[PDB]
Each structure stands twice: as structure tokens, then as C-alpha cells.
Amino acid sequence: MQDAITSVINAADVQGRYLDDNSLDKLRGYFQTGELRVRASATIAANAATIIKDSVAKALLYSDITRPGGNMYTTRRYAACIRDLDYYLRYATYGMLAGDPSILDERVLNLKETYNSLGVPIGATIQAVQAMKEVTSSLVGPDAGKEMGVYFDYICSGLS
Amino acid sequence: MQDAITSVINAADVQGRYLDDNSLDKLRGYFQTGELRVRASATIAANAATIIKDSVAKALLYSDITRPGGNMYTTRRYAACIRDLDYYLRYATYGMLAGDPSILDERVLNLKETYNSLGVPIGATIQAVQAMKEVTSSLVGPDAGKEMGVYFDYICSGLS
Amino acid sequence: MQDAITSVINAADVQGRYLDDNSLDKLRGYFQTGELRVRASATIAANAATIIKDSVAKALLYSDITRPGGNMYTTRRYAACIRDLDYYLRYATYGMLAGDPSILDERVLNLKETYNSLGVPIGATIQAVQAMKEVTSSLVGPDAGKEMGVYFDYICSGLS
Amino acid sequence: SIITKSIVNADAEARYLSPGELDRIKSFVLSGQRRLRIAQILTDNRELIVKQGQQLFQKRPDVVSPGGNAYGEEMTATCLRDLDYYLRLVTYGIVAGDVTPIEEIGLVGVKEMYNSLGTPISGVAEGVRSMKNVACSLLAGDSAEAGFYFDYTLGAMQ
Amino acid sequence: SIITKSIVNADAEARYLSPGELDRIKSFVLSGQRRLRIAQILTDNRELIVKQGQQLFQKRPDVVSPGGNAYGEEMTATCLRDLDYYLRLVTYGIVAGDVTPIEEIGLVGVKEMYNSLGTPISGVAEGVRSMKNVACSLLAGDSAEAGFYFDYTLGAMQ
Amino acid sequence: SIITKSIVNADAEARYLSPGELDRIKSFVLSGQRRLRIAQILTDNRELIVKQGQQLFQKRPDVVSPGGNAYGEEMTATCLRDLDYYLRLVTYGIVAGDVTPIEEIGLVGVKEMYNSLGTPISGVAEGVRSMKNVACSLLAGDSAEAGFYFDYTLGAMQ
Ligand SMILES: *[C@H](C)[C@H]1/C(=C/c2[nH]c(/C=C3N=C(/C=C4\NC(=O)C(CC)=C4C)C(C)=C\3CCC(=O)O)c(CCC(=O)O)c2C)NC(=O)[C@@H]1C
Ligand SMILES: *[C@H](C)[C@H]1/C(=C/c2[nH]c(/C=C3N=C(/C=C4\NC(=O)C(CC)=C4C)C(C)=C\3CCC(=O)O)c(CCC(=O)O)c2C)NC(=O)[C@@H]1C
Ligand SMILES: *[C@H](C)[C@H]1/C(=C/c2[nH]c(/C=C3N=C(/C=C4\NC(=O)C(CC)=C4C)C(C)=C\3CCC(=O)O)c(CCC(=O)O)c2C)NC(=O)[C@@H]1C
Ligand SMILES: CCC1=C(C)/C(=C/C2=NC(=C\c3[nH]c(/C=C4\NC(=O)[C@H](C)[C@H]4CC)c(C)c3CCC(=O)O)/C(CCC(=O)O)=C2C)NC1=O
Ligand SMILES: CCC1=C(C)/C(=C/C2=NC(=C\c3[nH]c(/C=C4\NC(=O)[C@H](C)[C@H]4CC)c(C)c3CCC(=O)O)/C(CCC(=O)O)=C2C)NC1=O
Ligand SMILES: CCC1=C(C)/C(=C/C2=NC(=C\c3[nH]c(/C=C4\NC(=O)[C@H](C)[C@H]4CC)c(C)c3CCC(=O)O)/C(CCC(=O)O)=C2C)NC1=O
Ligand SMILES: [Cl-]
Ligand SMILES: [Cl-]
Ligand SMILES: [Cl-]
Ligand SMILES: [Cl-]
Ligand SMILES: [Cl-]
Ligand SMILES: [Cl-]
Ligand SMILES: [Cl-]
Ligand SMILES: [Cl-]
Ligand SMILES: [Cl-]
Ligand SMILES: [Cl-]
Ligand SMILES: [Cl-]
Ligand SMILES: [Cl-]
Ligand SMILES: [Cl-]
Ligand SMILES: [Cl-]
Ligand SMILES: [Cl-]
Ligand code: NA
Ligand code: NA
Ligand code: NA
Ligand code: NA
Ligand code: NA
Ligand code: NA
Ligand code: NA
Ligand code: NA
Ligand code: NA
Ligand code: NA
Ligand code: NA
Ligand code: NA
Ligand code: NA
Ligand code: NA
Ligand code: NA
Ligand code: NA
Ligand code: NA
Ligand code: NA
Ligand code: NA
Ligand code: NA
Ligand code: NA
Ligand code: NA
Ligand code: NA
Ligand code: NA
Ligand code: NA
Ligand code: NA
Ligand code: NA
Ligand code: NA
Ligand code: NA
Ligand code: NA
Ligand code: NA
Ligand code: NA
Ligand code: NA
Ligand code: NA
Ligand code: NA
Ligand code: NA
Ligand code: NA
Ligand code: NA
Ligand code: NA
Ligand code: NA
Ligand code: NA
Ligand code: NA
Ligand code: NA
Ligand code: NA
Ligand code: NA
Ligand code: NA
Ligand code: NA
Ligand code: NA
């Protein structure tokens, strides 16, 4: 588990070098986006429920996926699905605040074969997380909304 | 874990339909074989020991399988083998009373690769379970003996 | 877990035979090397630390392996590496005293795919264990040093 | 199902069905015909059961009013659709002998579902309850079984 | 084997053989020659040991009588075959220094075995015991070791 | 890093960053510039910091004397190399906001390392401590942060 800062550090540790002007520059940049990240994390933390709502009704509800023969049709599979989206959003907020997507590859991704082996479709999941991207975006802004965009998309590329 | 009745139900749930005349018919049939199943389960429950006995002496004892170089030759491998046959019989009684073999695929089968990887032969196991089929049959009857037959055979097809 | 004696026994059990003159001969041999094995195990037990020291400084220290970008470069990876060599030595002493290498195949080997999947190099590990072979040898003698040689080499063939 | 339930209870202890559990299963199979009868009677009058909905709304007009979860004819309709779902679950349960199909299909995590959706759970309980008043009106005391089925539903919801 | 046993006991604690355990192993290796001698003496007279069986039957005629587990000359024979098995196990144990081979080969789950087979376990205990009376007759006090080996057998059986 | 630490602490409880932890992260990012300043000031004078080593030796001449772990100019040099390592770790920690990089890179299992190597740990503690006297001399009270960083190092070593 690293982030922008610790990523720069480790980039300056395996080579056995003190932090050079480049490290100081990248660290500078993250320090410049920090307040943004903090605020966005606060806002998402405050509205996680409503966001998962707008995502589910956005891409999922009132289709086959939710009807008999559907993957989120029963109430137990519905709770499992919204639970997955809650996880995805919370780790998207994590990675966002951090500045690097490794936490996703480490604690949520290492899942595609599982979904395949249990029938969980990936398409409606990609569309769902993307819906979370648009909802979160429109509710936080374009900058913070694109910064979540990169991580949401990252998860999409991980599942697909 | 389903059975005849719950199998019909689930057959009428993924389509989102109330139970139609067909469901009522199948349910009718199971209700017609119920008393038989109950009695047979009682009789097997009462004579499980003697049945595993007659099976072991039937297909296993007094051959290589039990002699040095054999898979049930030592006393620990003997207890493991008769324990396996006890399991198989008890889940055969289960599935029999239930009316559907999924419980086997769910709690005993998901075993062939294990036996292969630990040396447990499958042939003498098939012959053993079949011996349980003939013993149980002759001791319960032709109807209950064939109804156990379908599940014992199911396990044979699962191991082989 | 067997050894020279129990290996002879099991060799005389799967055939269902009492111990013949051959079994008595092999048992004789082990009984002839016993005191040697015991003493060597005492000496190694007394000097395990210094042996792992002389091995590490022998094949590992003052190269890339220990410097940044190295597999034992950080202090946590250093402790893990010397811990591995300690294990290897202790099971080499085990197998040595026993007279058969199965314990290695049973409790340390069943590791190559793990090292590959976590980046642990095998070359420096082979050279390290071999260094333990030369150190232990020169510190115990040629007979006990060759008897450890066969097991150390066994581990080398297991990793490689 | 009573059958699967005693099976799992027994296997949990690595034992055969006890003669008591077997006798229970016998009473079940002997109740099979009356059971199916109740099931098809409910299925036949399902639209009536769910429509007469009306009693719920009359008792909980807040859910259909502005700000309520079922404001509008489309959301009202969807809410009627859920009541249909649960009635079907009740018929399954009736046929099965216990609440297994109802739990498995529409009670494991319902509170989560409706919490996300913003549906008041007590409202659902009242809808299925009314569904048990009408349903009970369709059956002549037979009414017991389906009775405790509905009751287990509106209890388990909250 | 004493050697494998101290190995597993030590490894269980992630430690080297203690000097005491090492000394024990030394006493074992120094007893090797007398040990093998006892082993081959028993092996040589095995048929006598198992036959003189007779003492068991004389003391437990029920096992060979109608209704008994060893009724008939074929079942009697098989019962003699088991006694041979256990004597061989005793020779292994003698050579090894402890009861490991006996446990591993013919005591882990014996009660299960004979329970399925319908063999009275105390009968087996008496057979191997008699096997220790004869065996003890073949050895001149050397007799101790094999003694506690047999004893561990007829004890562990039940 | 303060950021990764609050992340892991929160995720451990399956929760979002609390407003307090968020505020802490805000204070960190606002301290970023002074932080980097301290980091580059230390990096600039690193050779001086490690050389002035001399104070350690003067205070612990045993380590460089016959029988000591750093006897000879080559072992002395290697010992200076370790001090360089730890100072670099201190700069990482300064930039990061906590002791994560120092722990991860050169405190998890150090006692094991130096025990194998035969290095007295208290000696290392004294070397990095002296490194904090010089370092503190290079900084004008800014000195606090790096101060507790070094201190956490020589504490965590033993
Ligand atoms: C009616 C008594 C109450 C009410 C209900 C209401 N429900 C919804 C939306 C959904 N309800 C479900 C329910 C189920 N799915 C299942 O698999 C099962 C078990 C078989 C049940 C009970 C689902 C999946 C949805 C959403 C999508 C879909 O139905 O296809 C709504 C919609 C709310 C909205 O804004 O969309 C309402 C209004 N409303 C009330 O006020 C009553 C208390
Ligand atoms: C004799 C003292 C008692 C007795 C014995 C009896 N045994 C059997 C049948 C078997 N016994 C075994 C025993 C072993 N297998 C092992 O691997 C080991 C450890 C090395 C032992 C001790 C086995 C496998 C069988 C069955 C098949 C076979 O032997 O090959 C019988 C047969 C009973 C029958 O009806 O078949 C008997 C009678 N009987 C007594 O009454 C004595 C107390
Ligand atoms: C100096 C204050 C003390 C001292 C030190 C000393 N160290 C060594 C040898 C090594 N030290 C390390 C240390 C690290 N590796 C890491 O990854 C980290 C974290 C970033 C640290 C701190 C390593 C790997 C070695 C060995 C090989 C190598 O350095 O490349 C020695 C050498 C001893 C010898 O006999 O070889 C010494 C002498 N000595 C003292 O007396 C001081 C208390
Ligand atoms: C953060 C780390 C992490 C994640 C992300 C995760 C996902 C995950 N999703 C699962 C199942 C599931 N996942 C879904 C998901 C969906 N269904 C839909 O229709 C939607 C389109 C979609 C969600 C958007 C469903 C229905 C199941 C249940 C399948 C079943 O067991 O019946 C399961 C199996 C366990 C269980 O829930 O019963 C795991 C382990 N697990 C983890 O440890
Ligand atoms: C119900 C679910 C279920 C089943 C059925 C099951 C089977 C099973 N059989 C096993 C071993 C075994 N199985 C046998 C079986 C046989 N040997 C013979 O000669 C006979 C022909 C045959 C039996 C008819 C033997 C000898 C072993 C032991 C192999 C060993 O570990 O030494 C093992 C390995 C664990 C152990 O017993 O030590 C499993 C896990 N496990 C389960 O969880
Ligand atoms: C006895 C039974 C047994 C053995 C032998 C064993 C080895 C083993 N070595 C490991 C890692 C490792 N092994 C090494 C070893 C080395 N690095 C070097 O440069 C050297 C050349 C070399 C040793 C000579 C290192 C650095 C790691 C850590 C990799 C990591 O997780 O970061 C790990 C992963 C767990 C961990 O340590 O964090 C296992 C499980 N495990 C066992 O259960
Ligand atoms: Cl630099
Ligand atoms: Cl689930
Ligand atoms: Cl989960
Ligand atoms: Cl219909
Ligand atoms: Cl086993
Ligand atoms: Cl098992
Ligand atoms: Cl022979
Ligand atoms: Cl580690
Ligand atoms: Cl480990
Ligand atoms: Cl169960
Ligand atoms: Cl229940
Ligand atoms: Cl062990
Ligand atoms: Cl023991
Ligand atoms: Cl965590
Ligand atoms: Cl900490
Ligand atoms: Na790293
Ligand atoms: Na370096
Ligand atoms: Na540069
Ligand atoms: Na850079
Ligand atoms: Na650079
Ligand atoms: Na900012
Ligand atoms: Na906010
Ligand atoms: Na729609
Ligand atoms: Na960024
Ligand atoms: Na899985
Ligand atoms: Na695909
Ligand atoms: Na199902
Ligand atoms: Na439907
Ligand atoms: Na039809
Ligand atoms: Na049908
Ligand atoms: Na149909
Ligand atoms: Na019947
Ligand atoms: Na009966
Ligand atoms: Na035969
Ligand atoms: Na049937
Ligand atoms: Na397995
Ligand atoms: Na095959
Ligand atoms: Na063996
Ligand atoms: Na034999
Ligand atoms: Na021969
Ligand atoms: Na031989
Ligand atoms: Na031979
Ligand atoms: Na010797
Ligand atoms: Na010694
Ligand atoms: Na060198
Ligand atoms: Na040897
Ligand atoms: Na692993
Ligand atoms: Na290779
Ligand atoms: Na069991
Ligand atoms: Na009971
Ligand atoms: Na009406
Ligand atoms: Na309305
Ligand atoms: Na409510
Ligand atoms: Na350990
Ligand atoms: Na001791
Ligand atoms: Na005689
Ligand atoms: Na006789
Ligand atoms: Na007895
Ligand atoms: Na959770
Ligand atoms: Na807090
Ligand atoms: Na100086
Ligand atoms: Na010097
Ligand atoms: Na010290």
C-alpha cells in the first residue's frame, strides 16, 4: 500500500538515492492537489448512500438484471450487488485521496475469475461503476470528478 | 440445497411465475412417493452398520485392496475407507428422501482429483458403492432399492 | 516422516514380509553411522548462528543482492532470508540424523513456485545453502560434512 | 421446505433423520393435497388479493403522498408489483412446509434493499398483512397455515 | 522410531535436538545389535509364537464357537493371520525403538475396523498377550523390550 | 505516510476517513512546503551529518577497536554507509509525515540483522543520535519534526 508520496519515496529507495529535484517536484504536485482530495473525500463520505442509490437506479433497476432470471433479482443478490458498489466507491475514495491505484490492485481486484465462476456479470458491473463515476462527478465537480474518474476507470479495466 | 419440491419452486421462481398445473403435478408425484421415502430412510438409518459391512465384505475384503500394498491395507486406511462408504450411504439416503441429487454435487462430490492425488482407487470405490446399492436394495425392496439406485449410480458417475 | 530405519520397515511392510537379512544389514549400517550423526547434530546445534553468519557473508553480503534493488536489501527481507537459511540448516540436520531426505520433501520443499511468484531468486539461494555446506563441512569434518552435503544438495535440487 | 430443513439439521450433526423428524415429514406429505389446494386457491385469486394495496394505502397514505416512497402511479404500480412478489413467495412457502423459499428469495437482506431504495419497511409489512386479511377472507378455517406464512413475512421484513 | 519421534517433538518447537534427546538416541544406536538380535529371534520362531492361537482359543472359546467371530476353520485361519500381522508389527517396533510403526500400521482406528467386522477387541488383546507369553518363553531376560511392545499392543487395541 | 496510515486505519474498520483524520491530512499538506524544505536541507548536508560518525566513535570507541564490530577502516566505512542509509530514511520520513517508510525499509527485523552481523544495536542508536545532534545543528527551530524522526529511529532500533 503506497500512494503518490510513498510511491516517489520507493522510487527513490530501490535506487538508493536521496530525493532529488524530481521527487520534490512530484511531491509538490500532490501537495498542491491535497486540499482538493481531502474535500472530495469528505463530500463522498457524506453522500455515499445517495450516490450508490443514483448509480443503481441509473444503470440497474427496471431491467432484466433485477427481474427473475436476474443476477441481482433476489433480495440477498440485491444486498450483495449494492455492497459491491459500496466497496468500489470507498476504495475509489481511498485511491483518490492517496494518489495511486495500487490499493485497488491489492485489496479489491486480486475478482474477475470469481465473478465469472459465480455468474456475476461484468458488463452491468462496469456500467454500474461508471454510473457511480457520473453521479459522483456531477455531485463533486469536474476536477474531483475526473480524479475519481481515473480510479473508477481503473476498476473497470481490472474487472474487464 | 434443493429437492423435488424446492426444485419445482425454483423452476417457478427464475421465470417469475406462480406455480402452474405442471408444478402441482410434480409436487403431487413427490407427495405420492413421500411415505415410501420416509420408510426407506428409517430402515437404512436402522441398518447402516450392517449395510456397510455387507458392502465391504462384498467387494473389498480378501483381495489385494486389503493386503499389503493395498489402499485399505493398514487399519487407519481401512477406517478412512469404511468412513467414506458411511458418508456415501448417508448422503444417498439424504438425496433419496429429498428427490434430487444436487446435495451430492454440493457436499460430497465437489473428490475425484483428491482420490487421484492421494492414490485412493476409483474402481474398487465404484464397486463398493454399487455393493451398497445391491445390499440396500435386497434389504429394503425393489422400489426403494431402485430409488437408492439412481443416487448411488449418480455418485458412481461423479467419481468416474 | 520416515528415516533409514522406518524406511527399511515400510520397505518390509507393503510387501507383508518380516525383516529379512537385507533389512538387518541396512539397519546395521545406520546403527554404525548413528554416533557420527548424533555428534554432528550436537555440533551444528551448538554453532547454528555462526554457520548462518559465515554462509551469508560468504555468498550474499557486499553484492547487488543486499543493495537497493536487492532481494535481501531491506532489513525485513534480510531477516526473512537468514530465517530461510536457518530453516534449511535445521532440516538438513534433521534429515542428516534421520538418514533419509523425505522430511525435506514433506515440510520445506512442497517453495520454488512461491519464490518465483514473490521474486525470491533461486540462484543466490542455491549458492547460500551451498555456502552452508562448505562452512558446516569445514567445521564438522569430511564424513559428517559429506553427509550434510547430500541433504544440502538435495534441497538445491528441490529449489532448482 | 420441511424436508430440506430436517436434512440440513441432521447432516449438521452427521446423523440420520430421527424417527420424530421422519414422522413430521410424514405429516407433511399427508398434508400435501390440502396444501396444494390452498396454494392454487391463493394463486387463482392473486390479483384480487394484491389489489384489495387499497387497504395499505388507506391505512398508510403517507407512502403514496408527496415525499412518500410510492408517490405517483408508476411508483404505486411498482409497490403493487412487490406485493405480488411476496404473495407468490407465500404460495411457495405454503407448498414447501416452512419459510425456506420466502427467506431465500425475499428476506435475506431486504432491509438493506429497501434502505437503499428509501422504502419504509413497516409499510411493506402492512401491505403483506392486508394481503393476509384478504387472503384469509378467501380461505375457510386451511387459513391457519397461510396465516403464519404471511405473519412470518411481515415479521421478518423488519 | 525414537529418532523420528524426537525429531518431530523438536521440530514442533522449532528447535534442535536437545543433548538429552541426543543421548537417548545414542543409547538406542548402542542397543542396535541386541535389538536386531531380538527381532530376528522373534521372526525365526514366528510360526511357533502365533500357533501356540491355541492358548487364546483355550482361554476364549467363545470366539471360535457358533455365533463367535472366528467360527469355522476359515475364520479361525484369518484370525491366526491377524496375529501374524501384529507379531510382525512387534518386530518392527523392536527394531525401531518405540511404538511408531505399530501405531501407524495397525492401531490407528483398529476399534473402528473390528467394530465393522464384528471382532471382539479384548479377544485380539488376549491373542497378542498369549503371543507375548510364548515370545517371552523364547527370550531370556532382552525379554523386557519386546514385553512392553506386546503390552502396548494389547493395551492400545481397546 | 500519514495519508496511507489513516487510510489503513479507516479501512480496517470499513469506514470513510473521519473529519478529524481528514483535518490532520489537511495540516500535513499545508506543512508540505516546509517539510520538503527540511528534507532538501538535510539531503544537502548529508555527508557532513554522517561524517561528524566521529562523535559516535569518540563516544563508543569499543566498536572500532579490536574485537569491536567496526574494527578496521573497511568495517568503519561500512558502518558509515549504514548511517547514511538511516539518514536517508529520516528524509523519507520527514517528507511522508510519519515513520512508515523508516519502519518498512530499515526497522522491521533490524535486531535480527545486526544480531547475525554481530553489530551492537545501542551503537547504531548512538550513531543516529549523533546524526540528530549535527542535523539539529543544521536546522533552526523545523528542528522538531526531524528530531522526533531520529528519536523514533534510535528508539525503534533496540
Ligand atoms: C409497497 C408495499 C411499498 C413500496 C415498494 C417499492 N418498491 C420499489 C422498488 C423495488 N422493489 C424491489 C423488491 C424485490 N425484489 C426482489 O427480488 C424481491 C423478493 C422476491 C422483492 C420484494 C426491487 C428489485 C426494486 C427496484 C427495481 C425493480 O423493481 O425492478 C419502489 C421503487 C422506488 C423508486 O424510487 O424506484 C417502491 C416505491 N413503496 C411503498 O411506499 C410501500 C411501503
Ligand atoms: C483373532 C485373534 C480375532 C479375530 C480376528 C478376525 N479378523 C478378521 C478379518 C480382518 N482382519 C483384518 C486385520 C488387519 N488389517 C490390517 O491392516 C492390520 C494391521 C497390520 C490388521 C490387524 C482385515 C483387513 C480383515 C478383513 C479382510 C482380510 O483380512 O483380508 C476376521 C474375519 C471376520 C469375517 O467374518 O470375515 C476375524 C474372524 N477373530 C476373533 O474372534 C478373535 C478375537
Ligand atoms: C555503525 C553505526 C555500527 C556498525 C555497523 C555495521 N554494519 C555492517 C553490515 C551491514 N549492515 C547492513 C545494514 C542495513 N541494510 C539495510 O537494508 C538497512 C535499512 C535501509 C540497513 C540499516 C547490511 C545489509 C550489512 C551487510 C552487507 C552490506 O552492507 O552490504 C557491518 C559489517 C560487519 C561485518 O563484519 O561485515 C558493520 C561493522 N558497526 C558498529 O560497530 C556500529 C555500532
Ligand atoms: C472490495 C473487495 C471485494 C469485492 C469488491 C468483492 C466482491 C464479491 N462479490 C460477490 C458476489 C456477488 N456479487 C454480485 C454483484 C452484482 N450483481 C449484479 O447484478 C450487479 C450488476 C453486480 C454489482 C454491481 C452478486 C449478485 C453476488 C452474489 C452471487 C451469489 O453468491 O449468489 C462475492 C462472493 C461472496 C458473496 O457475496 O456471497 C465476492 C467475494 N469481494 C471482496 O472481498
Ligand atoms: C462426504 C464428503 C466427503 C467424502 C466422501 C470424503 C472422502 C475422503 N477420502 C479420503 C481418504 C481416503 N479414502 C480412502 C477410501 C478407500 N480406500 C479403499 O481401498 C476403498 C476402495 C475406498 C473407499 C470405498 C482411503 C484409504 C483414504 C486415505 C488415504 C490416505 O490419506 O492415506 C480423504 C482425505 C482425508 C483423510 O481421510 O485422511 C477425503 C478428504 N471427504 C469428504 O469430505
Ligand atoms: C522450512 C519451511 C519453509 C521455508 C523454507 C519457507 C520460505 C519462505 N520464504 C519466504 C519469503 C522470502 N524469502 C527470502 C529469501 C532470500 N532472499 C535473498 O536474497 C536470499 C538469497 C534468500 C534466502 C537465502 C526473502 C527476501 C523473502 C521475502 C519476500 C517478501 O515477502 O517480501 C516466504 C513468504 C513469507 C514471508 O517470509 O514473508 C516463505 C513462505 N517457508 C516455509 O514454510
Ligand atoms: Cl540526490
Ligand atoms: Cl450471498
Ligand atoms: Cl465480502
Ligand atoms: Cl400461473
Ligand atoms: Cl488418514
Ligand atoms: Cl473427512
Ligand atoms: Cl523373512
Ligand atoms: Cl516479510
Ligand atoms: Cl515462515
Ligand atoms: Cl449442513
Ligand atoms: Cl427457520
Ligand atoms: Cl512436527
Ligand atoms: Cl507415543
Ligand atoms: Cl487494512
Ligand atoms: Cl506507528
Ligand atoms: Na515497496
Ligand atoms: Na546504496
Ligand atoms: Na539527477
Ligand atoms: Na521521479
Ligand atoms: Na532521477
Ligand atoms: Na488542493
Ligand atoms: Na463535505
Ligand atoms: Na427504465
Ligand atoms: Na493526481
Ligand atoms: Na473465491
Ligand atoms: Na469476457
Ligand atoms: Na436456487
Ligand atoms: Na416478474
Ligand atoms: Na401454462
Ligand atoms: Na414444470
Ligand atoms: Na410451465
Ligand atoms: Na409413498
Ligand atoms: Na424401519
Ligand atoms: Na473371496
Ligand atoms: Na423420485
Ligand atoms: Na484436498
Ligand atoms: Na481414470
Ligand atoms: Na509409510
Ligand atoms: Na500378507
Ligand atoms: Na529373501
Ligand atoms: Na532391503
Ligand atoms: Na528382500
Ligand atoms: Na557412528
Ligand atoms: Na558438540
Ligand atoms: Na566482496
Ligand atoms: Na547415510
Ligand atoms: Na503461498
Ligand atoms: Na528457472
Ligand atoms: Na465425521
Ligand atoms: Na430427535
Ligand atoms: Na379490490
Ligand atoms: Na398513487
Ligand atoms: Na419503517
Ligand atoms: Na519460526
Ligand atoms: Na530437553
Ligand atoms: Na503349538
Ligand atoms: Na476353529
Ligand atoms: Na471386547
Ligand atoms: Na463488510
Ligand atoms: Na474519528
Ligand atoms: Na566532520
Ligand atoms: Na577505524
Ligand atoms: Na547493544
Numbering used by the authors:
A (entry chain B), B (entry chain B), C (entry chain B): 1 to 110, 112 to 161
D (entry chain A), E (entry chain A), F (entry chain A): 2 to 53, 55 to 143, 145 to 161
Sentences from the paper on this structure:
Components of phycobilisomes in Gracilaria chilensis are Phycobiliproteins (PBPs): Phycoerythrin (PE), and Phycocyanin (PC) in the rods, Allophycocyanin (APC) is found in the core, and linker proteins (L) present along the whole system. PBPs are chromophorylated proteins that share a general architecture. They are organized as heterodimers (αβ), which assembly themselves into trimers or hexamers. The subunits of PBPs are mono or multi chromophorylated with linear tetrapyrrols covalently bound to cysteine residues.
The pure protein was characterized by its spectroscopic properties of absorption (λAmax = 651nm) and emission (λEmax = 660nm) and the relationship A651/A280 as purity index. The purified APC was shown to contain only α and β subunits by mass spectrometry experiments. The result showed that Allophycocyanin from Gracilaria chilensis was purified in an oligomeric state (αβ)3. The final crystallization conditions were 2mg/mL protein concentration, 300mM NaCl, 20% v/v PEG 6000, and 100mM MES pH7. Crystals were diffracted at Soleil Synchrotron up to 2.3 Å resolution. The trimer for APC was obtained by crystallographic symmetry (P321). The biological unit is a trimer of heterodimers as it was determined by size exclusion chromatography. Indeed, α and β subunits contained one phycocyanobilin bound to cysteine 81 and are stabilized by Asn71, Arg83 and Asp84 in α subunit, and by methyl-Asn71 (Asm71) and Asp84 in β subunit.
